[PDB]
Amino acid sequence: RVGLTEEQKQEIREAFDLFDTDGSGTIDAKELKVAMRALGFEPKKEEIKKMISEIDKDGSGTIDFEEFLTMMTAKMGERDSREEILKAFRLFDDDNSGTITIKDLRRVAKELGENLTEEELQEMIAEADRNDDNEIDEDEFIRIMKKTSLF
Amino acid sequence: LDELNNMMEGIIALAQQAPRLIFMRAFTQYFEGKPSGLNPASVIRASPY
Amino acid sequence: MADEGEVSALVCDNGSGMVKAGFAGDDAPRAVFPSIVGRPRHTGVMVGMGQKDSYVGDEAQSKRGILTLRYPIEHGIVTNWDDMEKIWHHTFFNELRVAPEEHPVLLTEAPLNPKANREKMTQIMFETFNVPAMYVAIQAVLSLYASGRTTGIVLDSGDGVTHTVPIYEGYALPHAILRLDLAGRDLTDYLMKILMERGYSFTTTAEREIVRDIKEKLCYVALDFEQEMATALSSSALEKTYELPDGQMITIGNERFRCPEVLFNPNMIGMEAVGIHDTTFNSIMKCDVDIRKDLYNNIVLSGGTTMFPGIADRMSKEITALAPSAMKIKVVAPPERKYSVWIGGSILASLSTFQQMWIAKSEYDESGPSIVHRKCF
Amino acid sequence: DLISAIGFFRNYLTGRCFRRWLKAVRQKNFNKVRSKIQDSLFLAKPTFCPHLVEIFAAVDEIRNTPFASNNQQLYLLQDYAELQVSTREHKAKPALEAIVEKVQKVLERVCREVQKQARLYQNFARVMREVTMLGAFIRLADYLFVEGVISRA
């Protein structure tokens, strides 16, 4: 259950607005598919139809901001999937070397609107790494993904 | 004044000569004889109030 | 407890200027809010502004200017208990938003607190909110609990409270604990006043908070107050001017370190109470002489006042100048030095064996609020 | 294209998974701190906590001991003498002996339990630790009691 801060509320409000200047307002299934295409999931018809059907409080289809926001709040709190996990690890890597350093973890934190400290980075390295190399390669990263997906 | 002193002396004395735990047969041997700490009348009169 | 096998304790850091309420097992208290009780200034002037019994916390700071901000807790000692019942009412229904009877209550008390203070919480809490169990802990004891220690002095200092609390083998010695109202509130009030000295407007509650945060970042304690007088007067490096986006370019010279030095030279603001280093030194000397070896060598800093850069060095040297040189001085200022009260409270409440120490509802109904004495330490 | 470089959509899984890693490390930090202080406290030990609560309930007799006739009665010098002596001793010395007896009984029970379990001998280290800090428990209880006596006087 991922709650939305002010940063993400503003970003999602602007994103929902990014669909309709024509005044319709009620964004659609294909536009939500475009939203998770920007999110880099594996967007197929089943996800679109099932999620919109189960979040439509009456069967609107052309989802408004309220139920759209509720649906994406449910999606964020829901379980992740491996193909976009790998795509997002490529996002993680600044050089696509498959590794994360102390400074790489710091910049990853700051990408989120979350400014952090060094002690956090050393403790992350010591915990999730097997030789404290400041290089979180593929197997270490997938290992920490298992540990943090077994919540 | 001296009888007030006598009654306060009774207060302090009966707060002081209770049989302390650190004196009995089954508890001194757990430490090395007499432990260090606080004495009833000592702290009673150390509190300036 | 912390999980839901036995319901998690309502861990509430009842500070002097900031109250942190939450649940055990967590590290960040879910209800972080100041220790003020805002009440409506009037009735016929704020129609539509949400008249209530009392605004609480950030809601107490919602109308931060046009509310009768009544202080329940001043320097640790709680001045009114109808405030807490309104604090609690806004806690379990507007801050934690969970029915109080669901979970036991954990409250933090300033050391050297009179008996009627604790009993009134027990009296009010059961009659209005009717929890089935709770337990009231000490602010400094939980601060040591977050620091991972159970033996040694705790210097917990919120907004106004400051208690040097020597603890041996788990017991805080009330004969030795020294009360001190000198804390960051007085220092911020000094920084409030000494910004007049450079010609910069600071008189409102909005300016009260801006200066407070400035103190928490910039006001670093002077390790040896004499040379900072020399450097600030022989150079402009300490005569720094800090920018605020509100349109007030404020200059502080020796003013920077003068604000936090009062913890060690109280006499500049007129305060004649012994400084926190002297308060620590005198307090431990009230204990047994031998246990002072690890008491002076356990100094842990906690509370809102402890958001002070460069504090550990001044703590150790001043205590070293007071305490015997051979006797060790372990001044510790962990990053939890503001959340230590709640973190340790969550840590203590998360103990599995700690799940029979709570006072049952029937126990209060029979023995009254004095049931705390039957389960105090 | 408009939604391709939005900050939150670029950061969606990066932030969510990195935050999962972050919170996992925070919670294990909390776990180790909690454990390494839990093995530093009397409350954790099941041999120590319940008898400690019993001591809490039993010591409350110190508070109810008037060491003198704390009344403004119309005494004489001698009348003051006998009534103040009576309230000094006859209604206090029994309380002293009773509290001494109950404390010695409770601590003897604790010591006998731990030492007989040691003679009978994971939990082995815990029992050995309790046997070791028997003395610390006794001393702390005694200092609590002396503090109470000082406050009462």
Automatic annotation (TrEMBL), chain D:
It is found in: Cytoplasm, Cytoskeleton, Flagellum axoneme. Belongs to the dynein heavy chain family. This is AAA+ ATPase domain-containing protein. It comes from Chlamydomonas reinhardtii.
